[model samples]
Target: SGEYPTVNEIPVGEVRLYQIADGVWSHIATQSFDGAVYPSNGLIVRDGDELLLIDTAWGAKNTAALLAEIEKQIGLPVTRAVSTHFHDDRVGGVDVLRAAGVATYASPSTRRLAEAEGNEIPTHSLEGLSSSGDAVRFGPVELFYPGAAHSTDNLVVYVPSANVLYGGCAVHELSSTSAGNVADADLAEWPTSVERIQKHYPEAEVVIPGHGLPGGLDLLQHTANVVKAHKN
Candidate 1:
């Protein structure tokens, strides 16, 4: 029941950017789709001479292109990166960042998942895979992992500066309440996770999902409604 639209024709390009919030941007891979599955999505926040990239997209080409675009746009060095989860689409581009001397981070559970998968992951232990609650602060910007939702190790990045929340695959915009692919989902806990996010960031006016466009807190409520309606 994969109702998601298939990507018939992939674009010939490196990476593209969408400004989700004031200084927050989403880097989407235009040419990395494998027909049915779309490419990964990431976010970039510039702070002075440092840049923080979230979710490294799919593979080498996409990541490299994203990095190139980041350089052109921000004119600053990428100092750090954070993965929303351990999924290949999210972590496959670690090598690209590592090559540029960028430190990568993830939730401890995500790191453990990557380690447990062993050689399945392209790289191992780039840097800090601390607790989920650990915050990455860059001047006015802050990225925090409230809890898991889409996957057990999913990270919800919060940018207090712009009052935007990056709900990485946890809250998508297009789907209805009773719809979602639960292959690796924790349906029982998903609703609570979304609620937790709502409680934690009551001031978040905008939410940038892993896929689809930016939206308001209604996205979080819709995700909770969907998970609750579908949970067995």
Candidate 2:
């Protein structure tokens, strides 16, 4: 109808944003490398006029296409984007959003690291989170950095409106028996970070991890155990 053509929904087994609660969604995408499959995640929050896209698809190209598709549904472009971390799966689509002038945010440390790694840099810098209970508030959403878990900059997003927790890479899905690929994880400190999250939001109804299927509060302890059980 407009200048942009109607974009089709995400391809099966590729990436998609499945609805969670009222105006809340999950951008779930599958990434493959060297013949191995891995899950990637992001969150989409319909905030009044424009949507807030958290994180991006694995590839920049895919993130661009995904944004176009998202536009068709929300009837407007995403104006705000929150980066939970600097990993490819976490900020991969940042270039697409940056080109579109989306208001992007990231932890100060994350921004510095992303810049060092030649990744798409965030527009707004959030105060770095610490184990001392530092959190960044963006509207009704809170980005909590309980401590280092999956990555030094890992964060968990809490949306009070829906009582949802987007646990980033710190929280695991239901089926994980071991901490995911932790070449960048803080293995010893992971559990404490997760415990801090539980103490803060025990009533969270929907919890989405950085990878794998969404689950209830059980995902918290499940992730705790998974990370605790693995040491290498």
Candidate 3:
């Protein structure tokens, strides 16, 4: 019964749900704009009894729909979630997350920078992810700060139990040829940032990027290459 479910095409857009590991799921957002399309990932984890989310869809509407889809599939309520950054594809649904009663935890800088960028913001941050060596435990997931990548406040959400990493916009998708959309990115720091992430989670079985196909650690390395190539 737990076989990876078929992709759910909801009102907001096409959603591809995958079972990365026990009690861990990836809500891949396939949204199109103008004449193009891409995939962004939102993570759903059924920790203990209640559920938790990591990142959200492109906009509030889609996030709400995605949450609804999650509830329908998991039969659990999501009371807490995290925003990895402030981009439209990452935190665009934060308002909807709040409306759904899902408490959002984000970095203080993300909140400040996001509002500065005129994007919706998450008011809270997870109680410190207890740090021990390379992994830090926050809520039911592990987190890492690899400095900056796609955005100034980018971070990675790692689920140790599931061996998955919600690599937000900080990690590019496997299909990309470049770092992409540097409107708010720090190219110089991106390389070492992602490398830190890679070194921290060398055992990540599944890695979900901010957009495109969710793959293995190669996604991490490929993104690093793209960043360095585009550094010029």
Candidate 4:
């Protein structure tokens, strides 16, 4: 019940695109963290004539590959993007996106944090999407920030067309035994954020986390449990 058959996997160097739904693909980028390489998940969504990218690969190199693969495999131009947070895994390729003339949106705070972190700043901000529990619609995708979980500016993307939720870092994979990284996490509020997501998107049938395989609602519960355990 938690698993969905991947439509296809398009590999391009350190980045790979896994189709999880009809027009939604989960893009995974591999990067070295503390000398060990790990995978981070983003999203690629097809919306009519344009593509909507949620989050990005780790850096320019991986992100460039991601864009090239998207063009080669899907042949659609990415016109808009949104980063779930200010982390490199989420916004590292923002420079590439901006260079490619993609309209990238993030919270004002996210833009500021990205600027402070030396990451490329997003060009746009959809009003009201930054507030906790607030939501804004972009094409077929819905961007929501459920307070703070993995990071202060973490945002979640929901696709109504495919009933898929790209809970980038805000929600953990079912296989996650721990919170993974909490350097800037709000632990006491993480569970509440996850709960808000579960309540707000009860219709989410396919859930994609920041890492690992996409699953169902069990992923949200698992994320809450993981944070609770780590808090204890």
How do all models score by TM-score? Answer: 0.82, 0.90, 0.87, 0.93
The TM-score obtained by model 4 is 0.93
Greater-lDDT candidate between 3 and 4: 4
Which residue ranges in model 1 land beyond 4 Å of their true spot? 1-10, 30-35, 118-140, 175-180
Q: Write the per-residue lDDT of candidate 1 for residues 1-232, one digit (tens) a residue.
A: 2222223333555666777667778777643344555644678887666778888857767788788888787677888787777776678778778887888776567778877865124333433325444455644456555555678777777888788888888877745545345667888777777877788788998887777556798888888877777774
Tell me which of candidates 1 and 4 scores higher on lDDT: 4
> Which 10-residue span in candidate 1 carries the lowest summed lDDT?
1-10
Could you tell me the C-alpha RMSD of candidate 3 in Å? 3.3
With candidate 1 superimposed using the best TM-score fit, by how many Å does residue 180's alpha carbon deviate from the native?
4.2
Looking at model 4, report the run of 10 residues with the lowest lDDT sum: 1-10
lDDT comparison, 1 vs 3, better candidate:
3
Which residue pairs clash in candidate 3? none
The better candidate by lDDT, 1 or 2, is 2
Q: What is the full ranking by lDDT, best candidate first?
A: 4, 2, 3, 1
Clash pairs of candidate 2?
none
Root-mean-square deviation of each candidate, in angstroms? 4.8, 4.9, 3.3, 3.1
